[PDB]
Amino acid sequence: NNSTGTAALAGKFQWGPAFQIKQVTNEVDLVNTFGQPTAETADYFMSAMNFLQYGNDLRVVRAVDRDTAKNSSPIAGNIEYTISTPGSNYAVGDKITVKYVSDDIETEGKITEVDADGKIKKINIPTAKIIAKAKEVGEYPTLGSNWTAEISSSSSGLAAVITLGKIITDSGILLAEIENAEAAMTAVDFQANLKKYGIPGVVALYPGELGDKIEIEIVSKADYAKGASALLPIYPGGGTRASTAKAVFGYGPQTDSQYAIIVRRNDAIVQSVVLSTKRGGKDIYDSNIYIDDFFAKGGSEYIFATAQNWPEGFSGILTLSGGLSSNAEVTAGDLMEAWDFFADRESVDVQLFIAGSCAGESLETASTVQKHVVSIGDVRQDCLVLCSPPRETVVGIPVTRAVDNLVNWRTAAGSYTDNNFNISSTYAAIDGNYKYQYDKYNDVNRWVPLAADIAGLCARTDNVRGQILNVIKLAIETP
């Protein structure tokens, strides 16, 4: 395609997919997918963006901390609680009351599952009011000490003991690759709470606080006819809200194990589908609409779900929260794990390697990541690993000091003996100052690794050096 200028980029982004070789072609198409540049993301958004200027195709891989990244979920609003002593002779809509020091805060809780003897098996306490009061008095999400829960005064039956913990802030789920896809959606620990708080397994598709803006609306074949009147409840916040299902769908839920799903971000009805919890079942087109499969195959850009522990006849409003992409602490290695996704010609045909994108990171990682990226093009020898200097070394100081630094770094010598870049590949193209662009998003002038740019400048000229596009200043010039 002029010799198939396929770039390759890996780094931290505001939005997943995490650890996936998702391909990108437009700017407005990468924003859609990994979108705005945060002050922790900048140099990677730019890296891509100002490449797609000379760019046909870009293959990226988002680096997430696997240990602390989180996909927004419906678990992450609820409130710890443990039925210390199941009562007896209780029933199902017996109301529960959460007090703050003998003072009523929430009074809309309610037992929701008993057995034959009235032994309390499951309850549901809305946290809208309490997290409010709790935030308001420093006890968030700690809680516990002055926070108490009693039953109606009273339900038919007696003896019970509910014990309150903290406000759960761990969404309890992270989706990365798809080999693990619903396998994380089906972890004892996760699936556990989906039972405990009687909700379905519906989570945001990509790690990130950006997922908190999603709001699923679920209606079953049951409350679908009453679709207008049916007053869907809101988990975990509380309160209700008139359904909308029949007022958005023509083709309504067919079988009793089919549900209407309406996904919203910012009041926008981002997606609208009908799915089934029973394998095989299809729409009027023999399209397998069994939940687990539908999503298993790029079914939805926004969310991801699993029929497992999906409450029968469940209808309500799910509120995703606790969503948490942490670039906060993506370790250098967490980057190298990512880059590795390209280290075999068997798998990915990628011609160029945007590497300078780490220019800004911890000087150490600035060097050791790239250094390693070179050792991927080296061992594969179907590419160009192009690489740029660390901001530290080139942007602040005057040229006098500037060059001294660069040359020391390229060997060992003075200050950068340790974090050197002392390698020598015929595939290694290093990258020689650092560019000063304007950031149409944050609306600020910003220094970015120049390598990202020249790489697109290659996909161009011949097959894979002529002024660069959007520069407005270079660290050194020229002369």
Beta bridge partners of 85: 161
Instruction: Please state how this structure was obtained.
Output: cryo-EM
What are the structural domain ranges in the chain? 1-67+326-479, 68-77+169-325, 78-168
CA–CA dist 219, 227 (Å, integer) = 8
CA–CA dist 58, 334 (Å, integer) = 20
Q: Which CATH number fits domain 1-67+326-479: 2.40.50.140, 3.40.50.300, 3.40.10.10, 3.40.50.11780?
A: 3.40.50.11780
Between the alpha carbon of residue 287 and those of residues 11, 155, 200, 217, 276, the distances in Å are 36, 47, 22, 22, 11
CA–CA dist 160, 164 (Å, integer) = 13
Beta bridge partners of 268: 265
Residue 32 tokens read as 């859609």
CA–CA dist 363, 417 (Å, integer) = 12
Residue 168 tokens read as 């759960």
3-state class (DSSP) for residue 374: helix
Give 285's Cβ-side CA count (13 Å radius): 5
Spatial contact of 186 and 78, defined as CB atoms under 8 Å apart: no
Phi, psi of 280, deg, nearest 5: 90, -55
- Choose among 217, 295, 226: nearest CA to 263: 217
Residue 417 tokens read as 């003996």
- Choose among 155, 159, 150, 164: nearest CA to 119: 159
CA–CA dist 263, 205 (Å, integer) = 12
- Choose among 376, 367, 369, 303: nearest CA to 330: 369
Q: What's 324's DSSP letter? A: B
Consecutive H or E run containing 478: none
3-state class (DSSP) for residue 54: coil
Residue 464 tokens read as 């894979």
Beta bridge partners of 120: 114
Q: Which CATH number fits domain 78-168: 3.30.428.10, 2.40.10.380, 3.30.1330.20, 3.40.50.2000?
A: 2.40.10.380
Which value in Å is the resolution of this experimental model? 16.0
Q: Render 273-300 in DSSP notation, one character per residue.
A: EEEESSTT-B-TT--B-BHHHHHHTT--
- Choose among 270, 304, 326: nearest CA to 73: 304
Please name the residues in contact with 277: beta carbons below 8 A apart, sequence gap of 6 or more: 257, 258, 259, 290, 291, 307, 310
CA–CA dist 333, 314 (Å, integer) = 43
CA–CA dist 325, 38 (Å, integer) = 12
- Choose among 395, 363, 404, 421: nearest CA to 473: 395
Spatial contact of 5 and 329, defined as CB atoms under 8 Å apart: no
- Choose among 233, 231, 278, 237: nearest CA to 259: 278
Phi, psi of 468, deg, nearest 5: -90, 155
Q: What's 172's DSSP letter? A: -
